[PDB]
Design a protein around this ligand. Structure first.
Ligand SMILES: *Cc1cc2c(cc1C)nc1c(=O)[nH]c(=O)nc-1n2C[C@H](O)[C@H](O)[C@H](O)COP(=O)(O)OP(=O)(O)OC[C@H]1O[C@@H](n2cnc3c(N)ncnc32)[C@H](O)[C@@H]1O
Ligand SMILES: *Cc1cc2c(cc1C)nc1c(=O)[nH]c(=O)nc-1n2C[C@H](O)[C@H](O)[C@H](O)COP(=O)(O)OP(=O)(O)OC[C@H]1O[C@@H](n2cnc3c(N)ncnc32)[C@H](O)[C@@H]1O
Ligand code: NA
Ligand code: NA
Lengths: 655, 655
């Protein structure tokens, strides 16, 4: 038997998974980092827009602060997130972005002088003072009433992933690409590590360690049309669910992006609009402050996208041999504001769309892009399976709720990595474990058998036909607009397939570097993660954030101010066991109301919502008359907990 | 913390340690093999004489068999060994030597025709038939009444060590030289592995594994004049003693060789005499069948050596600026029987003694050479610390008693490796262990601290002066002839030093590839192993085998038919805790009598000895009249247990 130990494993060398391993390895904990493909090729690299931090340097980031970011985030969450987490976060992003910039990351910085902004209408000539020259700059982004989205051109995610990964290499972390986690190791509801299958040699190894973190990124690939890389299949989400002890949260909360270059699905940044570029209809105008006057563009995903399907369902979808769609005209947004800062989102258009960006509008169309849900964990990172932590799009720490805010995911990545890191190092350095050879063997010898059955399998299902059929079902019925009948013909076929996925037959017998065998043990997992979303969504009868239910269009606060905690307790069962967890209004620093946009007055209101509001304004006004700063009041309304290292307040420009 | 796991560790890549790892790795058990210096440089390589196997091919090995070997062994043991083990052995050596020869080992084989033997007197012209051509040959050796000592020139140990080590490399075993074991890991009297210190990088690693075997070779270096390599310091013996749970056996049973080229101590084979070469006195004659008529040479170590000190103590020691001594004249033993088969033992003489062998006699003088005692284990290999096995000169499986028989040690090496191997594979493959992080840490973090104290040490003892002083004490008072008063001025200074060895100070502070720091943590161990022998010998008041007590010259059977089981229960104590274990006469296939040589009638006889003898001859004669073969009777007198693979009887020449 092959076994390898380390003080702290880290399943997923993404952007978040790496930051975490940095905060552990930097303090004696010998750590490992498994990964399908070499780290610097993760999906983070493909980050366009930027990182959002309540910084406040730019003439626009000006006057920004935790509170504003806090609110911007919370209101965007359509109130389905954990307020004290969103709080920990905001107070860390700033000092997170600074660390990065000090590690190399070249953030496009401010220059003394007058700019040439485009705003919504047109050119407005902005002027940055001179006490701002050389400080991290910002961009206007989706749903922000302040410019706090930082950037390094439009390939921001890239310069970050590298700056971090490079750091691990400096510390002696151990990267081990082409190695996949296929099952976690638990004994008495405790995680001892994982069972890994060397994608190349093909042999199973047991990776044991005191702690174990899972950062396997989104699951956008359970859908046919997604912007996510082809290795964002949620296998990692799947294996924590297969332990039947931990639970996935809001698995049905899937965010969709408005302008992914159709049909490839290759992203085309929001900096398009935040930089002034705007959406042209089929008639070719602005269904912009036409459908929603506070700008259609510069509104949340679930918003800006919704109507993008309305105009089309009214038959106004000017298709092609693949489908109806719209266009994004940034032709009028200068050839300097395009040939730079929308540099990729221009080459992307020439090499694929075979046309020019500073020329025309693109054949776009909303598709899946982010995955809020995932392994549900508490505020410190740990889950229900004590010992197993999580962070990144991969899990549901939930500072997102039912609608992530543009430029937050890759801020949550480093932030969460910093926070959940300190709490992971703590656990591994203290918790003592009882490693049992009988158990280790049970899991390993048990996984090996699994591989064999698959090879000696005699069933006759084309995993590629079952796989592709799943992605069809999802993208169709669980699209932007969901309804009772369709989230049933789905929850049904998705099940009928998890049953067919056990009768598959592969042609290539080899037990090594076999790609076919990979898609055989990978699919069944995806389906189980698919059932969690489809069924998870079917049950949740109302319309909140990215969850639009044509038949329960009102954001029910009285019944659905909870989180769909999906589990899979028994090995046999074909459908997830959805239990719900309620939210406490008397812990919210901001009570349930209108989100600043979206359709007005469409939420069946809850009584405690108001009551809490009153006593918020009570406390508010009293401590303002008393002469208390915003931190004192924050502390009043709702206190949040943070680790030592990241306690101090973020010093801003002009105090 | 750095931890490395494997299904079965193997502390000591000697000749035995490797064979063992072959029988485990060949059946799925992932194994490791620690070692001070690359394996093929072990001390086994320096084996001269040969391997003894009850083979019977040569006209002289003729009619040989297990029984004869059995007896030859047992009588040589001066009855202080475990009969059923010596039994397991003999029945395996033959099939052991065959395996070797099939693995490559080129054994000097028989040739059709008349030879030119020398015997004791002189040339006698021997003639091998023709049904013997091409079969493993043999040599006459120390204390054998049959020629069963096999060879490949006089560098036999070499071609073996390699043939085996080469095998490991073929199987994927993992050799890890320049890595030393400095403490074993036990929890509730069970061995989980060891704490290792990378001699190069200098950092401590925890090597955990279900089983753990220790084959650290003899401890001849606790003596000043020894033939053992400079890495035969018994550290490995020392660490099993430091767990305070397992016990060392007959630590005071140390074998001395008669002709080690004086003063260097570089061996000069017994093939010298077994090939006809004989010992010249100071007068220059033959104190040979002068002191003992059945040939002084071709008598056990404890025998042939004893008087070598008598002639000298009568003042007849024709010294030099280093000491008195004798000579070995093989000048008359042909220049072909010398320039070959005594090839090394000729170059050895020219490069060091600066003279020629087929010319003169050498400036020899008895010195330590073998180490019977060591980690006491049962018949299957395991010790008192369930989980920790042992094999090789390193431990006391005890098929030796108080006098190993020339050519047995490197037969015990492969044999024991084959047997104890099957019993080690079994244990590791079944026994399940409870590995605890708190424990692992306790040992490792605990060893690291130890290293530091040593570096930050402020005492002022020259470890090289304490070390060298120990080797003086031993070689003096615990020499061939021991006596009550001197095994007291010893047991005392040896203690007074283990107390000084804790106040040593090193000059080189570096914590890596530090040779000085090595001799600092190594010495204290040697002393504790030294106290076990000195005190072990002091207590044992009688003269048995290699234990010659000038004041208790009679081989006491009534009081001392036991084994000095030395332990060290508490960490503080300065003297080993000697307990004794008794031997059962009614299990012996051969009861306590005259050994075929040595001084006649010098053993205070025990009553059951005789009684057992009578009923041996009773059973004997009855089953002979009944028409029973020697295996049937053997089975009667005393049955021994063996592993499956090595059960079948060894097919001989002419049945
Ligand atoms: C797809 C996408 C995402 C995206 C974006 C544009 C596109 C096309 N633009 C963004 C933007 O402008 N601003 C922003 O804030 N976020 C943007 N995103 C999403 C964002 O990059 C992600 O949410 C974030 O990077 C997710 O965190 P993380 O860095 O940890 O995860 P990942 O990049 O998806 O990588 C997953 C890693 O885990 C390894 N893995 C996966 N499964 C396994 C298993 N089973 N075993 C072992 N390792 C595993 C992957 O190989 C990878 O390293
Ligand atoms: C010294 C000697 C021995 C000898 C001989 C001639 C000389 C000069 N001639 C012999 C002969 O003709 N016939 C015979 O039968 N035996 C003869 N011997 C002795 C025989 O070779 C030994 O008894 C036998 O080889 C002992 O078994 P083993 O092969 O296991 O042991 P070793 O060779 O002494 O090697 C010890 C190994 O263990 C490693 N080691 C030691 N301590 C440690 C620690 N603490 N940690 C890790 N590894 C350790 C050594 O490095 C080595 O590999
Ligand atoms: Na998420
Ligand atoms: Na021994």
């Amino acid at each position: 038997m092959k076994v390898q130990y380390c003080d702290s494993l880290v399943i997923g060398g993404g952007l978040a998974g790496l930051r975490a391993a940095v905060a552990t390895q930097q303090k004696g904990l010998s750590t490992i980092v498994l990964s399908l493909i070499p780290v610097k090729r993760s999906h983070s690299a493909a980050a366009q827009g930027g990182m959002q931090a309540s910084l406040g340097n730019s003439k626009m980031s000006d006057g920004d602060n935790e509170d504003l970011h806090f609110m911007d985030t919370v209101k965007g969450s359509d109130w389905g997130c954990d307020q004290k987490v969103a709080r920990m976060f905001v107070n860390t992003a700033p000092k997170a972005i600074r660390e990065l910039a000090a590690w190399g990351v070249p953030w496009t910085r401010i220059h003394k002088g007058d700019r040439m902004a485009i705003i919504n209408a047109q050119k407005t000539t902005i002027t940055e003072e001179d006490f701002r020259h050389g400080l991290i700059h910002s961009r206007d982004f989706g749903g922000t009433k302040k410019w706090r989205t930082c950037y390094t051109a439009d390939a921001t995610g890239h310069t970050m992933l590298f700056a971090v990964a490079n750091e691990c290499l400096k510390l002696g972390v151990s990267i081990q690409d082409r190695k996949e986690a296929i099952a976690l190791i638990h004994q008495d509801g405790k995680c001892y590590g994982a069972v890994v299958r060397d994608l190349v040699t093909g042999d199973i190894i047991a990776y044991v360690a005191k702690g174990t973190l899972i950062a396997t990124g989104g699951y956008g690939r359970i859908y046919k049309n997604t912007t996510n890389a082809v290795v964002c299949e949620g296998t990692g989400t799947a294996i924590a669910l297969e332990t039947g002890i931990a639970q996935l949260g809001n698995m049905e909360a899937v965010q969709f992006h408005p302008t992914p270059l159709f049909p490839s699905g290759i992203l085309l940044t929001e900096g398009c609009r935040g930089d002034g570029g705007i959406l042209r209809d089929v008639d070719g105008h602005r269904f912009m402050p036409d459908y929603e006057p506070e700008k259609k563009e510069l509104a949340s995903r679930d918003v800006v996208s919704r109507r993008m399907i309305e105009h089309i369902r009214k038959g106004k979808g000017v298709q092609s041999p693949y489908g109806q769609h719209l266009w994004l005209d940034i032709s009028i947004l200068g050839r300097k504001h395009i040939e730079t800062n929308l540099r990729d989102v221009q080459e992307i258009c020439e090499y694929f769309a075979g046309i020019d960006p500073a020329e025309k509008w693109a054949p776009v169309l909303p598709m899946q892009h982010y995955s809020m849900g995932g392994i549900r964990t508490d505020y410190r990172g740990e889950a229900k399976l004590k010992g197993l932590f999580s962070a990144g799009e991969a899990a549901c720490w939930d500072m997102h709720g039912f609608n992530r805010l543009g430029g937050n995911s890759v801020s949550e990545a480093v932030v969460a990595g910093m926070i959940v890191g300190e709490y992971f190092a703590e656990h591994c350095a203290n918790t003592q474990v009882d490693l049992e050879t009988k158990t280790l063997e049970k899991f390993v010898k048990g996984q090996e058998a699994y591989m064999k059955s698959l090879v000696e399998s005699k069933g006759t299902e084309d995993v590629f036909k079952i796989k592709n059929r799943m992605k069809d079902v999802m993208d169709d019925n669980v699209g932007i607009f969901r309804d009772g009948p369709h989230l049933e013909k789905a929850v049904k076929e998705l099940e009928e397939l998890y049953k067919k996925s056990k009768n598959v037959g592969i042609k290539n017998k080899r037990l090594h570097a076999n790609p076919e065998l990979e898609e055989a043990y990978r699919v069944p997992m995806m389906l189980k993660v698919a059932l969690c979303v489809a069924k998870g969504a079917l049950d949740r009868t109302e319309s909140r954030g990215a969850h639009n239910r044509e038949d329960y269009p009102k954001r029910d606060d009285i019944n659905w101010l909870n989180r769909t905690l999906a589990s899979w307790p028994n090995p046999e069962q074909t459908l997830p066991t959805l239990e719900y967890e309620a939210l406490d209004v008397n812990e919210m620093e901001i009570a349930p109301g209108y989100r600043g946009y979206g359709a007005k007055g469409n939420y069946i209101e809850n009584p405690l919502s108001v009551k809490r509001q009153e006593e918020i304004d009570k406390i508010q006004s009293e401590l303002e008359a008393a002469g208390k700063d915003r931190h004192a009041i924050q502390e009043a309304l709702m206190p949040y907990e943070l680790p030592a290292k990241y306690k101090a307040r973020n010093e801003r420009l002009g105090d």
